[PDB]
């Protein structure tokens, strides 16, 4: 609130270092690092919360000594003058970036078929590569570590070495959870096969012993009896009773007992 | 094709069963019960190994 | 729309509901018994037919 | 898939015609019980399929 | 890879010994390039190794 | 377009020389590699942008 | 089958006029509006039938 009346509101964002601790940062100013990402401010929303301020990334800065606050934009972008291979590994790179995204996707196409390489419009390839190495899910020790490098081909080496680390394990993921789902596959086939020879032989073996044997051999039973009609329904009702019922019931327990 | 694939499939719960009936081997049994014995055993196949009454079952026929 | 493809259910029982009305409908049935008849009905709908207390309620209709 | 059995009786055969003709005797012999394993395969399937869709239809009543 | 100036350059040769001669000189250069680079990943990979397994193992556990 | 209805259609493939320059390409015409390669052209497919030509280097020239 | 020999394959296309009538078209050239669009014929399928012209609108003319 206290920069709401600046003409140019400004907010910087930093990096924190390991074992992050909320009463250090208070205590002691030396536990954020030294680079330091100054940037322009958009908009408050507080939608939920009363703090849900928006950052981007405009302006790098590397302060000498954050504890003595002066700085300077030594934004360093030494390039060599002949230029018909250096975007070569640009070309390598958007197209790791397009395998990781189609088999890890993470966020939407859009952006990427709105910023297209052949078009031109890319004024800021090292923007570029840094928004391509954003979506690695490296820990931020990485993106510290990239951002120590100073030579070009040193930086780009590493976001690339990020990009096919996630790659690593992004399919090795991939492949345990396929092999688990085909085990499953082969599990549940194997079982399949076994209830067609279940349904196959339960005729010819067991005779439909789950109700039949029990059916048919008092039917037979009866036959060789002069069977009175009365009986004849009780014994009829009975039965359907009995198919209805599952085999495996202290009902179906109880009409079998009565039944014979 | 019924024989092939009763020998293409290893599994089966016969085992427990085959030792009550080996322990009714060396008793001289009556018909009465042997048959009885049958139609319990058919019953006990037939039902799965952790129902209630499978037990109630199992207990019987021990 | 209810009725999609389901028989004996969501209407009368065949076994035992449905059964009865033809038996029930050469009859002339008294309004007290139409309506204890048609209560007890509508409970053994509500009964699963393998429990106990629908079996009760099954015999008390027949 | 013929038997050795039925291998070594085609060879033999000593006219052509005949031997050729044990041949396509035999690849219809193994196409028999092969076409019989798939239509008994799909048939079971099937059944599976309309066993499952009037569950199906039972849930989408629920 | 080589340049498209190493191409031209190449196509710049008349006679077939020397384009030979080139051509073999950019696929050295380009291999020893490669190689380089390859031998470099091989030490960054085995220094990023050298974080314990612990590591890994946590990162199982979460 | 116009080549379609010319009685032999066909394209020549150059290479530019550095520091390229959309510009300079109609500007100034030596920019463009001395060296060329006329082949014919084989079909247009235009999938998503309107050119997407096939090109295959067949009869080199300088 | 007639343009398929002629140097310069190309195809017009024009409008008619209120009261279309087939046997018109053939009695009198009168019936057809005066503008004409020239275009280029694109590819002969003839899935369905025949006759599965692709036309486009290209050079107007009156």
New interface residues.
């Given amino acids: 609130r206290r920069k709401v009346r600046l003409a140019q509101p400004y907010v910087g964002v930093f990096l924190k270092r390991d074992d992050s601790n909320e009463s250090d940062v208070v205590e002691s100013l030396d536990e954020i690092e030294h680079t330091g990402t100054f940037a322009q401010i958009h908009e408050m929303q507080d939608l939920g919360d009363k703090l849900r301020m928006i950052v981007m990334g405009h302006r790098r800065v590397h302060i000498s000594r954050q504890l003595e606050m002066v700085e300077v934009e030594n934004v360093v972008h030494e390039d060599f003058q002949?230029t018909?291979?250096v975007k070569?590994l640009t070309a390598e790179i958007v197209k790791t970036i397009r395998d990781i995204i189609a088999l890890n996707p993470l966020y939407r196409e859009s952006v990427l078929q709105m910023m297209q390489a052949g078009q031109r419009v890319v004024d800021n390839p090292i923007y570029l590569s840094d928004m391509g190495a954003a979506l690695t899910g490296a820990e931020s020790h990485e993106l510290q570590d990239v951002l120590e490098e100073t030579n070009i081909p040193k930086r780009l080496?590493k976001a690339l070495?990020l990009l096919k680390?996630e790659f690593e394990l992004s399919k090795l993921q991939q492949r345990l959870g396929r092999e688990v789902e085909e085990k499953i596959k082969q599990t549940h086939r194997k079982y399949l096969l076994?209830?067609?020879?279940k349904?196959?032989?339960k005729e010819?073996g067991?005779e439909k012993?789950?109700k039949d044997?029990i059916e048919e051999k008092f039917r037979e039973r009866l036959k060789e009896l002069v069977v009175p009609k009365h009986v004849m329904d009780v014994v009829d009702e009975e039965l359907?009773k009995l198919g209805?019922?599952?085999?495996?019931?202290?009902?179906?327990?109880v009409t079998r007992n009565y039944l014979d």
Avoid at 194 to 197: D, F, I
Avoid at 244 to 253: A, G, Q, T, V
């Fill in positions: 002949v018909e291979e070569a080496y070495s680390k076994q209830e067609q020879l349904i196959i032989k010819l067991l012993d789950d044997a359907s209805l019922l599952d085999n495996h019931s202290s009902e179906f327990n």
